RNA sequence: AUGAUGUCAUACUUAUCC
């Protein structure tokens, strides 16, 4: 009465999204097209999970918050402390909170419409796929090279690297400005 | 058999050969596959296509 | 049964400008059954006085879409996207996209890109290479909608309409790379969606008198015309967005509906103000009106000036 | 079982069925009381009454054994009542 | 005729008396019916789409709001 | 007036939205739930949804102020996104056999279902049909 | 109060002891005249110009479209059996008595 | 593995679990063998005893 | 090959720069670079898994090159 | 709602009689239990207000002075829509105080 | 190295309440 999960994942034209609890459904054809939409959303992780998705993070004591810059900018914060160090006023300014708030006004780091909030969503610091010929600024800083990254010197003596084979590097196949040396 | 994104779950060999035909490109492959301009009459007698049109012009 | 239809010129022909007509046979009016399809050649003899028939190609789907892109013809058969060209018996297909979703309703095809609108899923941007003859799409969009005609506002924003008596508008991102080779990568965001209520089928941006602005002029089922003007100035969004919300306070409409319940019957409301709650200032009540520009600290002829500036701006 | 057909009660007379009922109800109960004889004038007053309904009301009024056999010898005798064209029972014929 | 199946009540709890919203426990086929049952009582509702719906048919709008009122009930057969 | 400040609460949202432990999650929805409500209609939507990527973890759970409190959080999610996104995130749920996730997901799916219920037409996908009964629309694909 | 320039543009200005708000349009490359009118039971104006713009409020919402016909140099309202409510413009050495019989507002 | 909280309170970093009183995390220390849970951490470090 | 082992590191390195370090060469597709909780900060010495043993091989030969913190980092076959 | 989670409302239909509030819970919502954003009055219905029954709270079921209304954010909601919500049931509130 | 249950404190919510 129920299909196997092959006869399942033939029959669909997007088989890489099909699940094993999706053979137990009333009606999986419809699923699998429910699924395997444009711009749809999956459900969450907890629909199998046993920890109610709240009690996961138990012995984690990371900062409770981070204020932005358009309030550390305006002296709340110090006076904050002082007052309650006092108590374990200020009067500063009046227009230069609402400059903060106005003109000074910085714009959050958004998400996506498909961007849900993972079970932990804090130590995957993903970021697209920095490759070959593309590197961060610090690293320059330990590498220690002036405005190629050395070892495309060694790039050339070896030669192009088998994991990246489409590749090409500054001055090699390459005919290079600011940070990236290979695309 | 190359594998793919949707032959991971695969266990038959049997399947995986009809999986890796319907995966073959998709179905296009036809970027000049009419392009010849054919001389002629220049109007409504034309029909060749881009191998055939290549050959009268490497032999006229 | 024809449904498309399309007049330029051939890059392989000279300066004669040819007329195709896409038609289907055996179109069936309830379960979409279709038997065939065909795509008929006019000449446009006399200097565009009398139509010759040249030749008629068929086609296995029905085409409902027609376009000229860089010398050729974009024929949208369904749910595949072809590049035909200019042929003595037919027209030889050069190219073929089978990536569409269900059927290819409209294509509007920029100078570079080619933007196709499908039937029940939004508009997708497409590429053409032109070195290899090959159609790949590098945008999408994540929300579904029933669109039935759409316009290019500038390369990377598009505005379509919505069967369900609704209009948006899509950007593209600036960081979108259209050289590449849940659906696709790059998503499109919606800038703009207003729901207009009434259906609309023909969108043009474009000077309705000289000297004024041009604005989003769009068509509807009802015999109806309105036109859309974008915001100049940041303080007139502000005032007009001021002004809005205290006419949909002070005067509600007579159906008992909520003009942001209007507003966002299919979609949500995005960056979009509706002229016609704003212009019953002078027809509600003088007290009211008083209040509003007390509220807005101006005076109520003073409101009525700044309305109908943007009317003498951006109408007739 | 019997409690599917549906009869009318508008087709059948009133007066006749009152002693076969009085005589199923002193069979079953063992006495004569007056719940059960309203209980039954009620079920009957509709033009249009409820077989499973009166079968729950006189289902468990007894023990659940001889409610569901007064159930079926007045379902019968209803049925017997609503098919003639006299729209009496087959007891009142001979008497 | 015991049948053993009062569906009464039980603490005043539950007891559904809305139509089209669903349970846990519903079927593909009971709520593919209500769906499309939902959708026929849409294009019934609006005007704009019951008018684009009947421009594109060659038949009338109250023809066609009968063939919707008709195939409301059992429009697929097995729930 | 939150038309503005929702873009500075967003981020600390996020922090507080991602647990440290229940009472987080829960006040935290309840704010997404009245700014959801508040915002309405001016088109600042984007974040929202990002934030709603973050609130949807948290639907699994029985503690009951937590559940509840989710529950408010998606319904004022749902008036302000729109529902087409919010049944975009609550399709594949509906399915699942397993005694948890089609509670919930249909839970939540009637929620969205009550409200709204004339604007959902459109969005409900295309599903093909089987043997005994025809389960496209073609009203829809009529074409002039 | 309407005033016409010698220019393609005119400047208006509300009734009060004291001049109060103003308008102007581009009416043009023509001197705008004025003329007082009866449209629809109302006094309204009919401007003399490359356009013939009639001016009349709809609603507490003033509404000016051109007429679709030749230019003129002289107008002036007209009531008689024949024509109730009319108005006759004078053209280049020739005489026509028009009537805006329908609602030139909107679109024609 | 003590460590302070910001409202008065212990919380310990090996048990990953919260401490109500001052007593509460001075009888994790004999129990909540957190310590002997650390040999795998200690050969993933060094490979040698 | 399809793993090295990576010594002389300094601990502002983190699995990061070794992500977009040795990727720089070649993929890393597992990254192991051990957190000491103890006193919370590293020793610096690597352990990369490959998507085969060709990219690793290259990488003994290639890989040897880098420099973290002014300092040597040793890249060898595991 | 949140003091009371155990009580019933009674979600009848919807009459002319307008609801009223007593002086104890005077300016707390119905539906959202809240103090500020009130956007419209609160409705009772027919059986719920006659005789003795007319006049009462709706949520205190006390002496009623001012008329009862609902928040804006229960009317943004839907939530002021539904029926009746006249306190029908009265659980585990004012029961064992009543002894004390 | 999660999870399991169970004796047993500790915080938190319900605008909980004389």
């Known amino acids: 009465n129920r299909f196997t999960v092959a006869e399942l994942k033939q029959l669909v ?27 749809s ?41 002082a007052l309650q160090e006092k108590e374990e006023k200020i009067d500063i300014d009046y227009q230069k909170l609402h400059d903060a708030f106005f003109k000074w006004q910085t714009k959050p780091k958004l998400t996506i419409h498909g961007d849900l909030y993972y079970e932990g969503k804090e130590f995957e610091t993903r970021l697209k796929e920095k490759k070959p010929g593309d590197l961060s600024d610090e690293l320059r800083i330990s590498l220690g090279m002036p405005v190629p990254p050395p070892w495309l010197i060694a790039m050339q003596r070896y030669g192009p690297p088998p994991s990246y084979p489409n590749l090409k590097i500054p001055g090699l196949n390459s005919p290079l400005y600011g940070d990236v040396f290979g695309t | 058999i190359p594998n793919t994104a949707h032959f991971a779950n695969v266990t038959q060999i049997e399947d995986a050969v009809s999986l890796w035909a319907k995966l073959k490109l998709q179905k296009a492959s036809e970027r000049w596959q009419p392009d010849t301009e054919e001389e002629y009459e220049d109007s409504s ?3 060749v296509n881009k191998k055939t049109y290549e050959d009268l012009k490497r032999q006229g | 049964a024809a449904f498309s239809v399309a007049v330029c010129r051939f890059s392989n022909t000279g300066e004669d400008w040819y007329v195709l007509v ?36 068929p086609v296995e789907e029905v085409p409902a879409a027609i376009a000229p892109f860089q010398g050729r013809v974009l024929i949208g058969v369904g749910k595949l996207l072809r590049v035909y060209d200019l042929g003595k018996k037919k027209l030889l ?3 073929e996209n089978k990536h569409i979703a269900n059927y290819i309703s409209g294509i509007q095809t920029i100078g570079h890109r080619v933007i196709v609108s499908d039937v029940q899923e939004s508009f997708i941007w497409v590429r053409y290479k032109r070195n290899e003859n090959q159609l790949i799409i590098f945008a999408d969009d994540t929300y579904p909608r029933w669109v039935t005609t759409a316009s290019l506002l500038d390369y990377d924003t598009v505005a379509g309409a919505d069967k369900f008596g609704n209009i948006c508008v899509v950007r593209l991102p600036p960081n979108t790379n ?37 604005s989003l002029v769009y068509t509807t089922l009802s015999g109806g015309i309105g036109i859309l003007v974008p915001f100049t100035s940041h303080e007139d969004h502000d005032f007009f967005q001021h002004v809005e919300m205290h006419l949909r306070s002070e005067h509600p409409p007579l159906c008992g509906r909520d003009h942001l319940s209007f507003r966002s019957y299919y979609f949500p409301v995005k960056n979009v103000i509706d002229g016609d709650l704003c212009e019953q200032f002078n027809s509600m009540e003088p007290n009211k009106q008083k209040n509003v520009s007390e509220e807005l600290d101006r005076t109520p002829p003073e409101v009525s000036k700044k309305l109908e500036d943007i009317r003498t701006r951006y109408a007739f | 079982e019997c409690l599917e057909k549906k009869v009318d009660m508008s087709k059948v007379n009133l007066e006749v069925i009152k002693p076969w009922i009085t005589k199923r109800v002193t069979e079953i109960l063992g006495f004569e009381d007056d719940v059960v004889i309203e209980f039954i004038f009620n079920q009957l007053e509709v033009k249009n009454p409820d077989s499973k309904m009166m079968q729950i009301n006189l289902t468990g009024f007894l023990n659940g054994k001889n409610a569901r056999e007064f159930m079926g010898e007045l379902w019968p005798l209803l049925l017997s009542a609503q098919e003639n064209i006299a729209g009496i029972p087959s007891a009142f014929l001979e008497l | ?53 009947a421009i594109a048919e060659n038949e009338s709008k109250a023809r066609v709001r009968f063939n919707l009122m008709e195939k409301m009930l059992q429009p697929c057969g097995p729930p | 007036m939150g038309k503005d400040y929702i873009y500075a609460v967003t981020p600390l949202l996020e922090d507080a939205l991602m647990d440290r432990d229940l009472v987080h999650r829960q006040t935290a929805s309840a704010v997404v739930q009245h700014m959801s409500l508040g915002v309405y209609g001016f088109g600042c939507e984007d974040s929202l949804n990002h934030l709603l990527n973050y609130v949807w973890p948290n639907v699994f759970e029985t503690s ?63 599903i093909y049909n089987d043997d005994k009964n025809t389960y496209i629309r073609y009203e829809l694909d009529y074409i002039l | 109060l309407n005033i016409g320039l010698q220019n393609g543009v005119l400047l208006r200005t509300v009734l009060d002891p004291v001049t109060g708000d103003l308008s102007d349009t581009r009416t043009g490359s023509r001197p705008v005249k004025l003329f007082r009118v009866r449209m629809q039971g109302q006094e309204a104006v009919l401007a003399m110009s490359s356009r013939s713009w009639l001016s009349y409020s709809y609603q507490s919402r003033f509404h000016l479209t051109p007429l679709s016909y030749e230019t003129l140099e002289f107008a002036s309202g007209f009531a008689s059996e024949q024509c109730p409510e009319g108005i006759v413009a004078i053209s280049t050495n020739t005489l026509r008595i028009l009537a805006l019989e329908k609602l030139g507002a909107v679109f024609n | 593995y003590f460590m302070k909280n910001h409202l008065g309170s212990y919380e310990c970093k090996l048990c990953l679990t919260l401490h109500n009183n001052e007593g509460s995390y001075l009888a994790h220390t004999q129990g909540k063998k957190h310590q002997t849970n650390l040999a795998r951490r200690a050969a993933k470090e060094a490979k040698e005893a | 090959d399809a793993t090295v082992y990576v010594g002389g590191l300094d601990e502002k390195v983190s699995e990061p720069l070794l992500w977009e370090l040795f990727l720089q060469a070649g993929p890393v597709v597992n990254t192991h670079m051990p957190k000491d909780r103890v006193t919370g900060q590293h020793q610096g010495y690597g352990f990369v898994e490959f998507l085969s043993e060709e990219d690793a091989d290259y990488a003994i030969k290639i890989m040897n090159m880098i420099k973290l913190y002014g300092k040597p980092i040793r890249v060898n076959k595991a | 709602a949140k003091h009371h989670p155990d009580l019933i409302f009674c979600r009848k239909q919807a009459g002319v009689a307008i609801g009223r509030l007593c002086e104890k819970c005077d300016g707390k919502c119905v539906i959202c239990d809240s103090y500020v954003r009130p956007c419209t009055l609160v409705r009772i219905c027919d059986e719920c207000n006659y005789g003795s029954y007319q006049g009462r709270c709706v949520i205190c079921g006390g002496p009623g002075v001012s008329d009862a209304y609902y928040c804006k954010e229960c009317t943004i909601q839907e939530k002021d829509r539904d029926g009746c919500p006249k306190i029908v049931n009265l659980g585990s509130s004012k029961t064992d105080l009543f002894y004390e």
């Not at chain 1, 709240?54 to 358009?70: A, H, S, V």
């Not at chain 5, 009971?30 to 789409?49: A, I, K, P, T």
């Not at chain 6, 604007?119 to 409900?124: K, M």
């Open chain 1, 41 to 81: 959303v999956p459900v969450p992780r907890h629909w199998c999970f046993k920890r109610k998705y709240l009690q996961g993070k138990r012995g984690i004591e990371k900062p409770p918050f981070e204020l932005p810059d358009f309030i550390k900018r305006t002296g709340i914060q110090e006076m904050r402390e």
């Open chain 2, 45 to 47: 007698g034309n029909v």
């Open chain 3, 22 to 57: 896409g038609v289907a046979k055996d179109l069936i009016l309830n379960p979409r059954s279709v038997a065939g399809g065909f795509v008929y050649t006019y000449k446009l003899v006399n200097n565009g006085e009398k139509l010759e028939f040249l030749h008629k190609t």
């Open chain 6, 64 to 126: 009951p102020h937590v559940i509840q409190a989710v529950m408010g959080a998606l319904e004022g999610l749902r008036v302000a996104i729109g529902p087409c996104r919010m049944l975009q995130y609550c399709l594949q749920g509906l399915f699942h056999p397993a005694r948890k996730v089609r509670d919930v997901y249909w839970k939540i799916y009637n929620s969205i279902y009550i409200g709204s219920q004339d604007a959902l037409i459109a969005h409900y996908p295309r």
């Open chain 3, 178 to 214: 259209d050289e590449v080779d849940n659906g696709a990568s790059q998503k499109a965001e919606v800038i703009m969606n207003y729901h207009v209520g009434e259906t609309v089928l023909s969108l043009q941006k474009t000077t309705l008198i000289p000297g004024g602005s041009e």
């Open chain 1, 13 to 39: 034209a997007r088989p890489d999204v099909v699940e094993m609890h999706d053979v137990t459904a009333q009606d999986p054809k419809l699923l699998v097209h429910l699924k395997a939409t444009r711009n």
């Open chain 5, 1 to 53: 005729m015991t049948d053993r199946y009062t569906i009464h009540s039980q603490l005043e709890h539950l007891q559904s008396k809305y139509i089209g919203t669903g349970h846990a426990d519903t079927t593909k086929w009971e709520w593919l019916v209500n769906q499309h049952r939902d959708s026929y009582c849409s294009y019934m509702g609006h005007f704009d789409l019951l008018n684009y719906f």
């Open chain 3, 93 to 95: 297909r050069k190219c």
